[PDB]
């Protein structure tokens, strides 16, 4: 067979430097273990400094912090500060009461 699963091969980006270890399975496993959604902050409005309570009439943004059934995600999952989690949950509950979410 001339095919390998993507999970068993690492694609080295262009312009990056590499070591021989980057072709091993240890690199594959190490990349899975340390795979965190750290790029969310730059794409996370609520981790930017905006007040989540100003989005109570924008269900599309709020729908990014609820599960498929509408259950607000725990702070352990959203990664927000206590204040933003508190404000975001209020926004979602207000949005639900208005008839938008």
């Amino acid at each position: 067979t001339k095919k390998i699963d993507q999970s068993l091969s690492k694609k080295l980006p262009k312009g990056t430097i590499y070591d021989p270890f980057d072709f091993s399975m240890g690199r594959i496993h190490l990349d899975r273990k340390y795979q965190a959604n750290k790029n969310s902050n730059r794409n996370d409005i609520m981790k930017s400094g905006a007040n989540p309570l100003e989005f109570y009439a924008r269900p599309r943004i709020l729908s990014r912090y609820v599960t498929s059934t509408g259950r607000i995600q725990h702070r352990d999952i959203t990664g927000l500060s206590a204040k933003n989690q508190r404000r975001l949950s209020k926004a979602i509950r207000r949005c639900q009461a208005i008839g938008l979410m």
Partner: protein
């Protein structure tokens, strides 16, 4: 005094670094200072750090973050492999060239205001170059600056009525120009980001000047041939070039006309074989990466 000596000590010479020792993102340049110990000191676990490195370590190169921690260990990784990437680049003898034809950053050139005609582009870059700034510390750039700029109102309420009164009575299209120049002229004396942290040129990867020819017993070398590896068996998606792994760098390989038949045959194991490449040019991007362009020299 002891404080003076400490400031000049070899440990002080290493700049503070808390960057992750285990980083799984894109690596474009070295992030940690390589520490080396001599064989005699390695035999005694001596590295010039606070504590002895565990005897299990057989490498003579490491990178560290903290001399000591609350866990009573040193935070270190026994690797020094970014030095071999630099030395392999030196062996390829390809000077780094500017794709924009800019002045050489390692020479003290006499520059002029040719690019200074964008005073309003960069004077406001100080407040507009805030891509990743706090929502309130960036807002402190609005009141703190406003007061500083508002303290020059009297100076600009007299200079403008003494050097360009016509514009004040005709149009503000030129007044705005006199404003951008005024602040810069009154800011060049100031020190706003007087130290620039941007990478300077190659960043230290190569100090080789373009122009020199490589003499060899078989005559002057006209094309540099370097062994490499093809990573993918299908060109980079959306790009007309494949990717190769040459000397610790990932390059874009351009083929003469066709792709060798070993590609289809090998498939996803194409990286298992070594091909010969020719390094066309090497460029440096602002992210601090090296843009190496190669050519898959095939036996013919």
């Amino acid at each position: 005094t002891l404080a003076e000596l400490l400031g000049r000590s070899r440990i002080a010479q290493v700049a503070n670094n808390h960057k992750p020792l285990t980083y799984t993102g894109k690596k474009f340049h070295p992030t940690h200072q390589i520490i080396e110990t001599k064989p005699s000191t390695l035999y005694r676990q001596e590295w010039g750090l606070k504590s002895a490195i565990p005897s299990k370590i057989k490498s003579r190169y490491l990178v560290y973050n903290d001399l000591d921690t609350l866990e009573r260990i040193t935070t270190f990784e026994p690797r020094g492999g970014t030095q071999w990437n630099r030395l392999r680049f030196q062996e390829m003898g390809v000077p780094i060239v500017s794709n924009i034809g800019r002045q050489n950053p390692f020479f003290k050139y006499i520059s002029r205001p040719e690019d200074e005609s964008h005073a309003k582009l960069s004077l406001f870059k100080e407040m507009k170059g805030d891509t990743d700034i706090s929502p309130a510390a960036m807002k402190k750039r609005l009141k703190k600056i406003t007061a500083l700029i508002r303290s020059f109102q009297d100076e600009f309420k007299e200079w403008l009525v003494e050097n360009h009164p016509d514009e004040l009575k005709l149009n503000s299209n030129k007044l705005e120009d006199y404003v951008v120049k005024f602040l810069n002229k009154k800011l060049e004396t100031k020190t706003n980001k007087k130290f620039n942290t941007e990478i300077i040129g190659t960043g230290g990867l190569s100090y080789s000047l373009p122009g020199k020819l490589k003499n060899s017993p078989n005559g002057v070398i006209q094309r540099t041939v370097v062994p490499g590896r093809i990573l993918n068996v299908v060109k980079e998606n959306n790009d007309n070039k494949w990717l190769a792994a040459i000397g610790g760098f990932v390059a874009d390989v351009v083929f003469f006309q066709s792709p060798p038949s070993s590609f289809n045959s090998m498939g996803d194991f194409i990286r298992m074989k070594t091909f010969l490449f020719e390094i066309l040019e090497a460029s440096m991007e602002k992210n601090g990466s090296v843009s190496m362009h190669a050519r898959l020299l095939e036996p013919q």
